[PDB]
Amino acid sequence: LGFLGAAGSTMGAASMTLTVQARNLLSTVWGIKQLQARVLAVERYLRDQQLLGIWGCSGKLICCTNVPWNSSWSNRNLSEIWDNMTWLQWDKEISNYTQIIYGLLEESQNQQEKNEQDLLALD
Amino acid sequence: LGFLGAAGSTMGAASMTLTVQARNLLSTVWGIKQLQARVLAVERYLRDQQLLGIWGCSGKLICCTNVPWNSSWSNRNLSEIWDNMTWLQWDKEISNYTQIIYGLLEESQNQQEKNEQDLLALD
Amino acid sequence: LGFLGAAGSTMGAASMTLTVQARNLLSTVWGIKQLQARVLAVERYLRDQQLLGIWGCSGKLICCTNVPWNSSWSNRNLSEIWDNMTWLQWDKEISNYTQIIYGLLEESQNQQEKNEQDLLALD
Amino acid sequence: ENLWVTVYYGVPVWKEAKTTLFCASDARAYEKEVHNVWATHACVPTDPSPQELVLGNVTENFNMWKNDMVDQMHEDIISLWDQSLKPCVKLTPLCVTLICSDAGSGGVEEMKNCSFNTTTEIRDKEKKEYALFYKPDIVPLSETNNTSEYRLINCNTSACTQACPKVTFEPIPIHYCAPAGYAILKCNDETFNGTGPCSNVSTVQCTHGIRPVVSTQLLLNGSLAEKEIVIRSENLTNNAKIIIVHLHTPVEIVCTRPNNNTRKSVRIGPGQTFYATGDIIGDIKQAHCNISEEKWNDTLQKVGIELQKHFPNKTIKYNQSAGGDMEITTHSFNCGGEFFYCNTSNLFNGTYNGTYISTNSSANSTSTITLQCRIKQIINMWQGVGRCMYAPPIAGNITCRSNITGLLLTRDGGTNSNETETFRPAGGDMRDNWRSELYKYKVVKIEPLGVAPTRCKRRV
Amino acid sequence: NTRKSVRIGPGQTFYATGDIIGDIKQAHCNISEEKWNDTLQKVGIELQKHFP
Ligand SMILES: *[C@@H]1O[C@H](CO)[C@@H](O[C@@H]2O[C@H](CO)[C@@H](O[C@@H]3O[C@H](CO[C@H]4O[C@H](CO)[C@@H](O)[C@H](O)[C@@H]4O)[C@@H](O)[C@H](O[C@H]4O[C@H](CO)[C@@H](O)[C@H](O)[C@@H]4O)[C@@H]3O)[C@H](O)[C@H]2NC(C)=O)[C@H](O)[C@H]1NC(C)=O
Ligand SMILES: *[C@@H]1O[C@H](CO)[C@@H](O[C@@H]2O[C@H](CO)[C@@H](O)[C@H](O)[C@H]2NC(C)=O)[C@H](O)[C@H]1NC(C)=O
Ligand SMILES: *[C@@H]1O[C@H](CO)[C@@H](O[C@@H]2O[C@H](CO)[C@@H](O)[C@H](O)[C@H]2NC(C)=O)[C@H](O)[C@H]1NC(C)=O
Ligand SMILES: *[C@@H]1O[C@H](CO)[C@@H](O)[C@H](O)[C@H]1NC(C)=O
Ligand SMILES: *[C@@H]1O[C@H](CO)[C@@H](O)[C@H](O)[C@H]1NC(C)=O
Ligand SMILES: *[C@@H]1O[C@H](CO)[C@@H](O)[C@H](O)[C@H]1NC(C)=O
Ligand SMILES: *[C@@H]1O[C@H](CO)[C@@H](O)[C@H](O)[C@H]1NC(C)=O
Ligand SMILES: *[C@@H]1O[C@H](CO)[C@@H](O)[C@H](O)[C@H]1NC(C)=O
Ligand SMILES: *[C@@H]1O[C@H](CO)[C@@H](O)[C@H](O)[C@H]1NC(C)=O
Ligand SMILES: *[C@@H]1O[C@H](CO)[C@@H](O)[C@H](O)[C@H]1NC(C)=O
Numbered sequence: 001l002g003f004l005g006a007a008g009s010t011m012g013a014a015s016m017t018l019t020v021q022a023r024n025l026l027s028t029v030w031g032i033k034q035l036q037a038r039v040l041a042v043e044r045y046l047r048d049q050q051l052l053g054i055w056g057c058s059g060k061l062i063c064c065t066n067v068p069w070n071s072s073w074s075n076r077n078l079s080e081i082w083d084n085m086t087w088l089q090w091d092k093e094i095s096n097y098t099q100i101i102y103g104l105l106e107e108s109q110n111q112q113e114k115n116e117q118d119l120l121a122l123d
Numbered sequence: 124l125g126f127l128g129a130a131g132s133t134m135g136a137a138s139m140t141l142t143v144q145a146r147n148l149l150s151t152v153w154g155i156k157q158l159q160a161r162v163l164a165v166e167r168y169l170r171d172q173q174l175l176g177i178w179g180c181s182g183k184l185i186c187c188t189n190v191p192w193n194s195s196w197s198n199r200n201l202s203e204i205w206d207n208m209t210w211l212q213w214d215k216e217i218s219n220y221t222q223i224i225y226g227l228l229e230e231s232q233n234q235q236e237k238n239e240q241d242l243l244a245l246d
Numbered sequence: 247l248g249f250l251g252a253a254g255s256t257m258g259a260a261s262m263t264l265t266v267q268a269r270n271l272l273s274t275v276w277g278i279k280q281l282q283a284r285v286l287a288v289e290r291y292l293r294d295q296q297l298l299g300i301w302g303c304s305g306k307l308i309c310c311t312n313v314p315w316n317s318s319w320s321n322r323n324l325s326e327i328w329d330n331m332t333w334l335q336w337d338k339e340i341s342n343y344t345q346i347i348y349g350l351l352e353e354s355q356n357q358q359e360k361n362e363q364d365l366l367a368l369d
Numbered sequence: 370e371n372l373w374v375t376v377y378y379g380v381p382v383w384k385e386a387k388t389t390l391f392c393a394s395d396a397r398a399y400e401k402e403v404h405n406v407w408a409t410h411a412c413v414p415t416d417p418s419p420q421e422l423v424l425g426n427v428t429e430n431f432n433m434w435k436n437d438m439v440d441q442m443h444e445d446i447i448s449l450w451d452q453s454l455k456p457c458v459k460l461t462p463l464c465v466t467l468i469c470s471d472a473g474s475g476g477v478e479e480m481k482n483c484s485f486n487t488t489t490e491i492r493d494k495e496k497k498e499y500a501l502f503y504k505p506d507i508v509p510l511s512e513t514n515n516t517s518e519y520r521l522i523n524c525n526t527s528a529c530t531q532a533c534p535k536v537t538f539e540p541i542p543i544h545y546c547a548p549a550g551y552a553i554l555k556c557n558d559e560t561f562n563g564t565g566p567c568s569n570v571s572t573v574q575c576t577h578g579i580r581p582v583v584s585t586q587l588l589l590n591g592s593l594a595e596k597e598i599v600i601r602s603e604n605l606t607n608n609a610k611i612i613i614v615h616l617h618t619p620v621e622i623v624c625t626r627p628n629n630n631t632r633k634s635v636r637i638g639p640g641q642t643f644y645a646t647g648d649i650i651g652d653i654k655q656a657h658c659n660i661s662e663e664k665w666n667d668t669l670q671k672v673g674i675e676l677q678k679h680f681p682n683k684t685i686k687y688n689q690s691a692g693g694d695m696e697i698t699t700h701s702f703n704c705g706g707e708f709f710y711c712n713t714s715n716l717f718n719g720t721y722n723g724t725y726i727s728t729n730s731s732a733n734s735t736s737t738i739t740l741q742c743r744i745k746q747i748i749n750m751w752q753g754v755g756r757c758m759y760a761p762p763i764a765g766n767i768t769c770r771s772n773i774t775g776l777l778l779t780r781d782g783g784t785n786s787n788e789t790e791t792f793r794p795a796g797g798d799m800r801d802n803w804r805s806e807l808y809k810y811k812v813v814k815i816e817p818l819g820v821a822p823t824r825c826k827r828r829v
Numbered sequence: 830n831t832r833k834s835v836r837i838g839p840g841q842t843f844y845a846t847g848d849i850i851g852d853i854k855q856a857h858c859n860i861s862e863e864k865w866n867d868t869l870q871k872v873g874i875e876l877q878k879h880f881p
């Protein structure tokens with residue numbers, strides 16, 4: 001499947017297709033407009049890569065972070081989320097809470113890296 | 124050495140020169156061309172790095188995958204390939220089957236990541 | 247604390263502030279200059295990232311490399327180096343021997359990768 | 370017991386380098402629906418939180434006479450001044466001989482009638498029109514003693530381009546910002562001579578509000594000093610280096626004008642029209658400027674008592690410039706789209722012999738210094754590559770209630786055994802104002818990579 | 830003589846040929862004889878490889 005093969009499919013079945021939607025992010029009168037759009041696409045991909053790498057999840061598609069999830073954010077059972085819902089309604093009802101989640105991931109990565117350098121220096 | 128030092132040597136001797144060759148991938152009328160060339164050099168490097176990053180071989184010059192090697196692609200022995208064949212005609216021979224290999228590495232990486240996720244969430 | 251927190255401090259005192267000094271590497275007539283500065287920032291970040299990524303220290307501060315330190319570069323003990331001298335004049339006296347050091351780390355990393363290749367293929 | 374190479378990311382080391390810079394402006398200047406302020410709308414909006422980090426215990430060399438920010442500022446102002454006149458009206462058919470005479474009503478000195486003829490929408494028919502051109506914009510071409518043939522001044526050299534009647538020449542502040550991987554070192558020393566070491570250097574993303582005013586001799590709106598008057602010079606020995614005086618207490622300066630009629634619209638082709646001076650309703654009065662007397666007197670006295678530091682056994686003196694044309698010998702500036710060229714003979718008439726004369730009289734603030742002058746319309750700034758502008762007139766009366774911040778002086782040829790050398794106001798190139806504004810800053814490139822020998826060894 | 834400067838507009842001045850001081854001589858070119866002869870001879874003897 002090419003563009004958006006599982007944009008409405010099963011949540012548990014949409015985790016087998018993240019590669020094809022991530023493989024294609026880069027592939028005078030109009031000598032400046034396409035240049036600006038192409039540089040903007042490059043910085044969009046680079047911002048995404050740096051935001052992945054800032055919490056220790058670079059080069060790995062599905063990465064895991066040890067920070068917990070509060071009950072005031074979603075309060076919904078996992079089984080019917082992963083077997084009934086889609087991605088679009090999740091982005092509809094979670095996107096207002098994303099900044100504090102990103103801050104929590106950044107703080108957890110900072111704590112993990114500081115324990116790592118403390119363990120490396122103490123040994 | 125320099126620009127493609129082992130460009131025609133033995134296959135085995137060309138595996139210890141990857142660092143000194145991959146390092147040079149980024150290093151008015153005549154102002155548009157220079158900027159366009161610089162941008163397309165960034166395009167080619169980011170495409171190559173992303174393609175390495177899809178199948179879990181990011182930041183590694185030599186990486187191993189667990190996909191089986193079909194004998195119909197080459198039908199050749201290992202010893203004379205690694206001690207007698209230059210990279211150029213090898214890439215000429217395998218050029219008819221590169222997309223199948225790329226898709227197989229992509230599928231193997233996704234399947235391996237799903238098995239790792241199942242094993243890690245089992246605990 | 248953003249740019250240059252301890253730019254004139256002790257060598258050993260600058261080790262604990264590395265996590266806050268290198269955080270902002272990416273965060274008509276006056277449209278061309280903006281485009282050129284934008285592309286130049288992309289070039290600087292990608293060159294820095296790949297040059298840190300050749301010798302196996304991608305996404306890791308204070309990286310240790312097994313290449314031996316030749317005595318013809320500094321010939322002075324590490325005690326007063328790490329508790330007496332700032333970064334700037336040390337960079338002034340080390341700048342004549344940077345390419346040989348970069349080649350030595352590149353060769354050491356590639357030999358390490360080939361050793362790991364032979365070790366994993368021995369099983 | 371041995372040493373191994375360890376790579377460090379985030380090393381704070383500097384390298385001197387040159388690069389292109391951004392543009393930053395406040396968000397309040399984008400609300401105007403008419404394109405103005407010579408295209409200062411494409412800059413990125415600056416953040417409402419200025420970040421300034423002070424460096425701990427480091428010193429840094431500084432040199433403002435050899436700087437890259439001043440040259441880039443000058444080239445940016447030159448190119449953006451040349452870019453804003455591209456879709457404007459061209460004054461090609463205004464090279465016709467002007468049959469000029471004095472007006473019948475009144476005297477109306479410094480203006481002439483200068484009625485001409487111009488083409489209509491038909492290339493065959495031509496019609497007569499009239500205007501009121503200024504005296505310095507009119508050159509008497511002559512082959513005999515003819516007192517009626519006159520022509521336009523800029524039809525002899527080059528250009529002939531009108532300014533568009535929708536832009537403004539007000540000095541909106543701009544900030545020059547370095548890209549990622551670069552920083553700006555700023556020296557906060559109050560006694561900064563201009564070249565040498567600095568011990569309170571601070572890293573800065575980008576500068577404060579820089580006002581790109583156009584001025585000669587005296588300096589208009591700008592940042593003040595910190596503690597006292599500060600004097601800058603390149604060598605302070607030769608007589609060819611323009612010496613800059615940076616003030617601390619500003620002196621109020623105002624400038625006025627009489628009343629014109631309107632902008633008379635004359636058509637010189639299909640769609641292309643120009644606005645000239647029509648009649649004059651009212652009386653004829655001189656366009657002058659006013660400066661407070663005692664503020665100028667004790668400001669020049671403070672400049673004297675601190676300029677006597679470098680010449681301890683000598684007295685200083687002031688007079689006018691050493692001759693020349695109109696554009697160099699006069700303090701010239703802009704207000705409301707109208708250009709002013711005024712002599713400063715009444716402002717530089719004095720001397721200081723080493724004795725302070727106080728002025729303790731609160732009831733004698735009535736006395737002021739007046740500067741009488743004329744107004745040009747055809748503009749030849751930048752001393753070349755300027756693309757000469759025809760500034761359209763302004764209907765109502767205009768006022769230039771402003772602030773003064775600096776002086777541009779120049780020494781004379783000192784004779785042998787002289788103790789009463791004089792200082793004169795200076796013109797020169799436009800780089801001196803921005804060099805007096807960009808004294809604090811130096812662009813620099815940070816290198817976040819380094820190597821060091823450690824006791825750590827990687828796992829085999 | 831010089832560039833005779835003729836002005837045909839506001840700043841658009843061109844330069845034409847002015848006078849001529851002296852006699853009138855023809856602008857010529859010179860090539861050495863034996864060098865050109867043996868150069869063309871070498872061209873012939875090497876071009877004879879493709880034509881027997
Ligand atoms: C140094 O610093 C001084 C101090 O700011 C600057 O002086 C200012 O100059 C600007 C012009 O660039 C002046 O702005 C003009 O003010 C005129 C009078 O304003 C009064 O009247 C209007 C109503 O007519 C009121 O709204 C206002 O509050 C005042 O009560 C206006 O008539 C001008 O309008 C022009 O511009 C607009 C916008 O483009 C056009 O639509 C109009 O048609 C017209 O062309 C203009 O707004 C400002 O008043 C001056 N300040 C002071 C305190 O007087 C110097 O310019 C600056 N630089 C130098 C080199 O000296
Ligand atoms: C400049 O000269 C013109 C004529 O060449 C004057 O225009 C005349 O003004 C009188 C006003 O009494 C009219 O009666 C005429 O019809 C006008 N003649 C025209 C328009 O061709 C003009 O007034 C003069 N300028 C000034 C300032 O007086
Ligand atoms: C056309 O412009 C030239 C300048 O390139 C004028 O030449 C000088 O102009 C000044 C200003 O009036 C005079 O004082 C000089 O005497 C002029 N000559 C020289 C040799 O410097 C020239 O006069 C202009 N044409 C006319 C007719 O005035
Ligand atoms: C001066 O530099 C030293 C560097 O060892 C530093 O420890 C000290 O704090 C500095 N002094 C001040 C006042 O910052
Ligand atoms: C200007 O042009 C008109 C054309 O209508 C002509 O009659 C007249 O003689 C010309 N000259 C002057 C000085 O008006
Ligand atoms: C250096 O400049 C800063 C600017 O905020 C000032 O607060 C500080 O006092 C200065 N340092 C000294 C030693 O005066
Ligand atoms: C300019 O300065 C240099 C060094 O500061 C000095 O040698 C030279 O004499 C100065 N120039 C003049 C004209 O005095
Ligand atoms: C200014 O220069 C002129 C030029 O000769 C000179 O005569 C005069 O004495 C100087 N000083 C004053 C105050 O005018
Ligand atoms: C300025 O004023 C002086 C003194 O009255 C006068 O001599 C001079 O002609 C005036 N104009 C200029 C352009 O200097
Ligand atoms: C300067 O001031 C003196 C005394 O105040 C006065 O006599 C003289 O006219 C003024 N102007 C010049 C150009 O000397």
Ligand SMILES: *[C@@H]1O[C@H](CO)[C@@H](O)[C@H](O)[C@H]1NC(C)=O
Pocket residue numbers: 766767768
């Ligand atoms: C000149 O314009 C100003 C606008 O600030 C106005 O206050 C003043 O009354 C005007 N002058 C006259 C003589 O009306």
Ligand SMILES: *[C@@H]1O[C@H](CO)[C@@H](O)[C@H](O)[C@H]1NC(C)=O
Pocket residue numbers: 590591619771772773
């Ligand atoms: C000029 O001085 C006056 C009086 O001190 C002040 O109100 C005004 O803001 C100053 N101008 C600028 C541009 O700061």
